[PDB]
Design an enzyme around this catalytic site. Structure first.
Site, mmCIF file in Angstrom:
data_model
loop_
_atom_site.group_PDB
_atom_site.id
_atom_site.type_symbol
_atom_site.label_atom_id
_atom_site.label_comp_id
_atom_site.label_asym_id
_atom_site.label_seq_id
_atom_site.Cartn_x
_atom_site.Cartn_y
_atom_site.Cartn_z
ATOM 1 N N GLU A 81 0.856 -1.195 0.000
ATOM 2 C CA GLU A 81 0.000 0.000 0.000
ATOM 3 C C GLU A 81 0.890 1.242 0.000
ATOM 4 O O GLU A 81 2.101 1.152 0.245
ATOM 5 C CB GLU A 81 -0.948 -0.003 1.193
ATOM 6 N N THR A 118 3.127 -8.224 4.187
ATOM 7 C CA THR A 118 4.098 -7.864 3.150
ATOM 8 C C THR A 118 5.495 -8.248 3.643
ATOM 9 O O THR A 118 6.231 -8.945 2.961
ATOM 10 C CB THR A 118 4.013 -6.355 2.830
ATOM 11 N N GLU A 150 0.491 -12.929 13.852
ATOM 12 C CA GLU A 150 1.910 -12.695 13.553
ATOM 13 C C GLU A 150 2.737 -13.981 13.711
ATOM 14 O O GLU A 150 3.667 -14.202 12.938
ATOM 15 C CB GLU A 150 2.481 -11.480 14.318
ATOM 16 N N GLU A 157 34.094 -11.021 6.688
ATOM 17 C CA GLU A 157 35.091 -11.774 7.436
ATOM 18 C C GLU A 157 34.535 -12.209 8.807
ATOM 19 O O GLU A 157 34.767 -13.330 9.264
ATOM 20 C CB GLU A 157 36.360 -10.933 7.588
HETATM 21 N N1 LIG Z 1 10.693 -1.736 14.937
HETATM 22 C C1 LIG Z 1 9.634 -1.455 14.160
HETATM 23 N N2 LIG Z 1 8.633 -2.386 14.005
HETATM 24 C C2 LIG Z 1 7.578 -2.072 13.186
HETATM 25 C C3 LIG Z 1 7.493 -0.858 12.518
HETATM 26 N N3 LIG Z 1 6.341 -0.866 11.804
HETATM 27 C C4 LIG Z 1 5.707 -2.045 12.012
HETATM 28 N N4 LIG Z 1 6.452 -2.786 12.896
HETATM 29 C C5 LIG Z 1 6.184 -4.143 13.341
HETATM 30 O O1 LIG Z 1 5.955 -4.907 12.161
HETATM 31 C C6 LIG Z 1 4.902 -5.842 12.387
HETATM 32 C C7 LIG Z 1 3.727 -5.450 11.506
HETATM 33 O O2 LIG Z 1 4.168 -5.562 10.181
HETATM 34 P P1 LIG Z 1 4.278 -4.343 9.182
HETATM 35 O O3 LIG Z 1 5.691 -4.111 8.679
HETATM 36 O O4 LIG Z 1 3.605 -3.114 9.728
HETATM 37 O O5 LIG Z 1 3.311 -4.869 8.005
HETATM 38 P P2 LIG Z 1 3.543 -4.844 6.418
HETATM 39 O O6 LIG Z 1 4.888 -5.417 6.023
HETATM 40 O O7 LIG Z 1 3.436 -3.459 5.923
HETATM 41 O O8 LIG Z 1 2.431 -5.880 5.918
HETATM 42 P P3 LIG Z 1 0.851 -5.560 5.575
HETATM 43 O O9 LIG Z 1 0.573 -4.188 6.101
HETATM 44 O O10 LIG Z 1 0.121 -6.713 6.197
HETATM 45 O O11 LIG Z 1 0.746 -5.578 4.079
HETATM 46 C C8 LIG Z 1 4.527 -5.726 13.859
HETATM 47 O O12 LIG Z 1 5.268 -6.678 14.580
HETATM 48 C C9 LIG Z 1 4.916 -4.292 14.168
HETATM 49 O O13 LIG Z 1 5.194 -4.069 15.525
HETATM 50 C C10 LIG Z 1 8.519 0.070 12.662
HETATM 51 O O14 LIG Z 1 8.512 1.167 12.074
HETATM 52 N N5 LIG Z 1 9.585 -0.255 13.482
HETATM 53 MG MG LIG Z 2 43.508 -10.774 5.602
HETATM 54 MG MG LIG Z 3 1.582 -2.429 5.741
#
Ligand SMILES: Nc1nc2c(ncn2[C@@H]2O[C@H](COP(=O)(O)OP(=O)(O)OP(=O)(O)O)[C@@H](O)[C@H]2O)c(=O)[nH]1
Ligand SMILES: [Mg+2]
Ligand SMILES: [Mg+2]
Ligand SMILES: Nc1nc2c(ncn2[C@@H]2O[C@H](COP(=O)(O)OP(=O)(O)O)[C@@H](O)[C@H]2O)c(=O)[nH]1
Ligand SMILES: N[C@@H](Cc1ccc(O)cc1)C(=O)O
Ligand SMILES: [Ca+2]
Ligand SMILES: [Ca+2]
Lengths: 420, 440
Positions: free
Chosen positions: B71, B145, B183, B254
């Site tokens: 998205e 994603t 998750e 390394e």
């Molecule tokens: N450390 C950290 N964790 C994040 C962040 N954003 C989302 N999360 C974690 O990532 C997980 C949620 O996945 P996202 O990366 O938001 O989801 P996406 O990859 O965009 O997947 P969809 O939205 O389902 O299409 C959860 O465990 C959140 O706590 C961030 O900016 N920093």
């Molecule tokens: Mg060396």
């Molecule tokens: Mg997302």
């Protein structure tokens, strides 16, 4: 028996080789531009052994610089004597060898090796009478170890009647870059057993300990280690580089030092090493603390020894002291090789010293070094640990089994002459 | 030379990417418009920083990075924000509809519509490299994603780039900031699918980072911005050897030689120090000894687990800033004579050290004090398997009743895929037990 062609391979090999060329260049009165500014005729008499002459009385090292990445050779080229090397003799790749013997020997190195042989051939072609080759490298990395031993095999194929000599840095866990060093060193040692006439065994643990215990350097750098190696290589090549009767060429040295073809691994030593009289020089050169293979000479017997004294000193006293060492510790010299210690003296001392001595010993104690590597190899190999780095380059486990067996055989052959 | 291409996938991957690239620009003196006054070779070069930034003839230093999300709203903020000029628009790739916290949508239903475009964009970056070393892939375990699209992309990168190296920075879920009940399913599915395609993966437990922010930075309720600034310092520590030169600098590849004893055993534990507020750092110089000691404090680990209750197969110390070997060696000796550091019997026990002399940097408005020296320890410890055990157990609880599984089946997946993935995780846990047992 005139020209020697020098090859230096990988990071260690190039870093020590650069230092070697700085040191002997100074000794021969050659400045970084390849110009001679010496005051003694001894300096030039045998200069052709290591240097070619160019237009305008320029001297150029007969040296080939090899690596699978550019970094170290860029540094060499920027170094003190960097401009003295033939530009066309820098032969290097970009991908690196990842501290991996398989990458050096079979894949990355295989892609570069023909271009190295082209330069080797060009140097050999301008030799009136090529003695052979000297290679500087470590056994614990990927390029010097894997590609260095690949080069040795191809050189032997093309020049089978020439002498092959190496200065080979042996890895130690106390002065280590990666855990796979014992695998790389085991694979290499089997190549050296077959394809070199003379190998100087330089243990990084010994270098470290000398720097720390003896020289009182609290935190030795690779640079500090390389200063010792530099000094040692200068000493052991003195007889090749200056007028003299004994061990004056690589073959005569081999004939004096190697009574059985596989036992050609030498412990070098240097004196003085301090934080000087002939007696003191002589005692220190035979002192285990002054040797560079981390093996105790009293744990074995000397098959053969070459001693080289440098500086202005009494040859009478030199002869007297060398006899005193043999006559007072005669049990450490095998009795079935009569008069197995040969001594040379060169009037020209190394920089910063009025006199020095260099020791080259063929001692059965060197088995301790191969034993240490063998133990370290097995600790990992019994669990096939880290082997994916090698199998990924096409090697199989059976090649490791064979190398380990070969090195254990070498250890057994030393022990046999220790009890002879 | 050796270029590295970064791929930031989904919200976590993108927002962590934002924080990393901002930090890199500050470390290298690159402005938001991509200009770098200190760089005297215009339009290209082979400096260390060029591993991460290409250059245009107009002097722009452009991240070797693709940002991808299913998205548009997270990447839209990049496109309109402070570093919008840093990136070519084609490096920022979005679809219209996300994976809805469903691995199946990320890997199949939605992911499949954009995968070819993403590969085309990555190829465009790769074609500009003269000696590409590999990829660094940033993503969550928990998102649809981050889990499903990442897996698909990793599979496709194996096909198109062969065994070119692929490293991951993977965000492991914590209840304090998680947004989906499923998750654990997504995490197991992606871990199974990516395992054969990844050479090295650095897990970042959000709960570990959350508690470090709360405890060491006195942040009441950490936001993603707080978490990501800390994560970026850690990622920066790990990549610094690729981006800076130096006599005592040791390449990440390394360290990897020592860290990965078998292909599947490729999950290092990172521990970082010092994490301290300006208020606490003031008039308090933390020495090499102090920051090194802190690496063996479990509270400073980036994954919650207890290495004192496992065995080590490698220990690496990545220092940056005002650090010399003499002080490192002294600190290590002290630690040896005082810590629960037991190695397996088949690995040497020496610690592998690298030092990068460029001091650590902080982003304005941040929580971390600017310090003169820092360290990241990377260890290979059997203890990291506790993280898999926790996830695996949550998976089992729900899967036993097939809770939520219909969402995945509806998108074309089969129960067979769940059991295959979980069996692979059970085998990985067993692998970690086995490596720790003494040799016969
Ligand atoms: N450390 C950290 N964790 C994040 C962040 N954003 C989302 N999360 C974690 O990532 C997980 C949620 O996945 P996202 O990366 O938001 O989801 P996406 O990859 O965009 O997947 P969809 O939205 O389902 O299409 C959860 O465990 C959140 O706590 C961030 O900016 N920093
Ligand atoms: Mg060396
Ligand atoms: Mg997302
Ligand atoms: N004495 C010494 N040893 C070195 C030096 N550089 C690396 N080593 C050692 O060489 C081995 C690693 O091999 P290296 O030459 O760096 O790998 P390569 O470039 O693949 O040949 C290890 O045993 C190191 O301890 C050096 O400058 N001097
Ligand atoms: N006992 C096995 C442990 C092991 C673990 C994981 C593997 O992938 C392989 C092997 C060994 O050391 O050989
Ligand atoms: Ca190639
Ligand atoms: Ca430039």
């Amino acid at each position: 028996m005139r020209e020697i062609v020098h090859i230096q391979a990988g990071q260690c090999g190039n870093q020590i080789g650069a230092k070697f060329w700085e040191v002997i260049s100074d000794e021969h009165g050659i400045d970084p531009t390849g110009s001679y500014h010496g005051d003694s005729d001894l300096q030039l008499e045998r200069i052709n052994v290591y240097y070619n002459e160019a237009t305008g009385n320029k001297y150029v090292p007969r040296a080939i610089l090899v690596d699978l990445e550019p970094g170290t050779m860029d540094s060499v080229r920027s170094g003190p004597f960097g401009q003295i090397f033939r530009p066309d003799n820098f032969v290097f790749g970009q991908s690196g060898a990842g501290n991996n013997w398989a990458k050096g020997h079979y894949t990355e190195g295989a892609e570069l090796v023909d271009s190295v042989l082209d330069v080797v051939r060009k140097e050999s072609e301008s030799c009136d009478c090529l003695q052979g080759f000297q290679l500087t490298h470590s056994l614990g990395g990927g390029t010097g170890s894997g590609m260095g031993t690949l080069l040795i095999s191809k050189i032997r194929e093309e020049y089978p009647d020439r002498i092959m000599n190496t200065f080979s840095v042996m890895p130690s866990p106390k002065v280590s870059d990666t855990v796979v060093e014992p695998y790389n060193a085991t694979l290499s040692v089997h190549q050296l057993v077959e394809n070199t006439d003379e190998t100087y065994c330089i243990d990084n643990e010994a270098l470290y300990d000398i720097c720390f215990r003896t020289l009182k350097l609290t935190t030795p750098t690779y640079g500090d280690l390389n200063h010792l190696v530099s000094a040692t290589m200068s000493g052991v090549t003195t007889c090749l580089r200056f007028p003299g009767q004994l061990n004056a060429d690589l073959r005569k040295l081999a004939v004096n030092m190697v009574p059985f073809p596989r036992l050609h691994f030498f412990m070098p030593g240097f004196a003085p090493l301090t934080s000087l009289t002939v007696p003191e020089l002589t005692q220190q050169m035979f002192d285990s603390k002054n040797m560079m293979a981390a093996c105790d000479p009293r744990h074995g017997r000397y098959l053969t020894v070459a001693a080289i004294f440098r500086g202005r000193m009494s040859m009478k006293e030199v002869d007297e002291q060398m006899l005193n060492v043999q006559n007072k510790n005669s049990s450490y010299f095998v009795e079935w090789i009569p008069n197995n210690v040969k001594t040379a003296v060169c009037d020209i001392p190394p920089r910063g010293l009025k006199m020095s001595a260099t020791f080259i010993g063929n001692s059965t104690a060197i088995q301790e070094l191969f034993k240490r590597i063998s133990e370290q190899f097995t600790a990992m190999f019994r669990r096939k640990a880290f082997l994916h780095w090698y199998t990924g380059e096409g090697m199989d486990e059976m090649e490791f089994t064979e190398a380990e067996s070969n090195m254990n055989d070498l250890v057994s052959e030393y022990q046999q002459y220790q009890d002879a | 030379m050796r270029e590295c291409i970064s791929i930031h996938v989904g919200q976590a991957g993108v927002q962590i990417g934002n924080a990393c690239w901002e930090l890199y620009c500050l470390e290298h003196g690159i402005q938001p418009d991509g200009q770098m006054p200190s760089d005297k070779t215009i339009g290209g070069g082979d400096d260390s920083f060029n591993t991460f930034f290409s250059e245009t003839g107009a002097g722009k230093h452009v991240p070797r990075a693709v940002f991808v999300d299913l998205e548009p709203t997270v990447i839209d903020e990049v496109r309109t924000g402070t570093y919008r000029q840093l990136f070519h628009p084609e490096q920022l790739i979005t679809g219209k509809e996300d994976a809805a916290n469903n691995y199946a949508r990320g890997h199949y239903t939605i992911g499949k519509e954009i995968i070819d475009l993403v590969l085309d964009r990555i190829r465009k970056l790769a074609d500009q490299c003269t000696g590409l070393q590999g990829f660094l892939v940033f993503h969550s375990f928990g998102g649809g994603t981050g889990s499903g699209f990442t897996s698909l992309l990793m599979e496709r990168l194996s096909v198109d780039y062969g065994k070119k190296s692929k490293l991951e920075f993977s965000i492991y879920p914590a209840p304090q900031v998680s947004t989906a009940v499923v998750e654990p399913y997504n995490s197991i599915l992606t871990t199974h699918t990516t395992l054969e395609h990844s050479d090295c993966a650095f897990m970042v437990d959000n709960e570990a980072i959350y508690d470090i922010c709360r405890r060491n930075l006195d942040i009441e309720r950490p936001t993603y911005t707080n978490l990501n600034r800390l994560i970026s310092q850690i990622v920066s520590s790990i990549t610094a050897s690729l981006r800076f030169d130096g006599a005592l600098n040791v390449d990440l590849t390394e360290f990897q030689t020592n860290l990965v004893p078998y292909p599947r055993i490729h999950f290092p534990l990172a521990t970082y120090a010092p994490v301290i507020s300006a208020e606490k750092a003031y008039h308090e110089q933390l020495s090499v000894a102090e920051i090194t000691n802190a690496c063996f404090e479990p509270a400073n680990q980036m994954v919650k687990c207890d290495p004192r209750h496992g065995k080590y197969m490698a220990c690496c110390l990545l220092y940056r800033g005002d650090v010399v070997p003499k002080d490192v060696n002294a600190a290590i000796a002290t630690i040896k004579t005082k810590r629960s550091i037991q190695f397996v019997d088949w690995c040497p026990t020496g610690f592998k050290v690298g030092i990068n002399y460029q001091p650590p940097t902080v982003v304005p408005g941040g929580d971390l004090a600017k310090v003169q020296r820092a360290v990241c320890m990377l260890s290979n410890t059997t203890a990291i398997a506790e993280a898999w055990a926790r996830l695996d157990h949550k998976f089992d609880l729900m899967y036993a009743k097939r809770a939520f599984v219909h969402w995945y089946v509806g998108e074309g997946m089969e129960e067979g895929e769940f059991s295959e993935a979980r069996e692979d995780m059970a085998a990985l846990e067993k692998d970690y037990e086995e490596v720790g047992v003494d040799s016969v």
